[PDB]
Design a protein around this ligand. Structure first.
Ligand code: NA
Ligand code: NA
Lengths: 22, 137, 137, 22
């Protein structure tokens, strides 16, 4: 059941990236 | 012989009054941070409604129970422990979107413990975050 | 290294968002009852601020603890059991004045249990009360 | 300690009275 745990941190890592440039 | 309408009007009425009293506890500094965070977390919400819903889906946010809400807290804290300002503003939005979804089910105690404990962890090393919201202008 | 300002801005921010979602649960009927009860309980508050404070004094409202808040609930329920509309609108105002006084100490769990259980008892036999607020006009 | 209990119900009984006429 660890796969759901990974994608959540992975999906938050994208939002912060896109949001650091702008 | 209980009136469904009155009970929920009185409850809401008092809570609304209780929120105003929490608002007067926010100071010039905190009142502006609030407004600045408001704008950032709102703009995040439109573009990343697509993205934040997926997080709301992975985390089973309909579970509405401590056994799960405790897991939602642990997982959100784990993401912070592994914490730049951008992510923080995104965690706030996520919680706002959990509130939007589960706002009709009513106020429950675990979420409060979650909102406080997460709000608390975000306050850690505020320095890097204050700059982010105040280089807006 | 915890920032006092941010924590309380995030907490308030989410709660404010949680109140709005409780508001959308109020319907045309309940939204108007709310506004009508609002006006009555406000007018009560100016004239009977002198009078309601004395009640807030007898009941030690600064005790902010369940052991006492449980007693405040029992006593308020006892007054209802011994319940005409006028008294009911006055109980609501009293609670609003307890909120005004203890609103800076923060949201605590017992008061919620009080606000709900009292709001609940008031809903009993709503019929006599609905008439009171709707013979305004 | 019953005296505080009485005056609270007594003081609420006045507010409802004044408020029933108006
Ligand atoms: Na509140
Ligand atoms: Na609420």
């Amino acid at each position: 059941d660890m796969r759901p745990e990974i994608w959540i941190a992975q999906e938050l890592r994208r939002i912060g990236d896109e949001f650091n440039a702008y | 012989n209980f009136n469904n309408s009155i009970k929920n009007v009185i409850v809401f009425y008092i809570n609304e009054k209780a929120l105003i009293e929490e608002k007067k506890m926010l100071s010039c500094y905190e009142n502006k941070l609030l407004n600045l965070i408001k704008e950032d977390c709102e703009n995040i919400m439109l573009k990343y409604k697509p993205n934040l819903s997926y997080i709301c889906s992975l985390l089973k946010v309909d579970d509405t129970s401590e056994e799960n809400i405790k897991h939602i807290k642990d997982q959100i804290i784990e993401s912070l422990e592994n914490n730049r300002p951008s992510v923080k503003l995104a965690i706030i939005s996520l919680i706002s979107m959990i509130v939007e979804m589960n706002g009709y089910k009513g106020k429950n105690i675990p979420m409060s413990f979650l909102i406080e404990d997460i709000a608390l962890k975000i306050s850690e090393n505020s320095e890097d975050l204050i700059n982010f919201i105040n280089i807006k202008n």
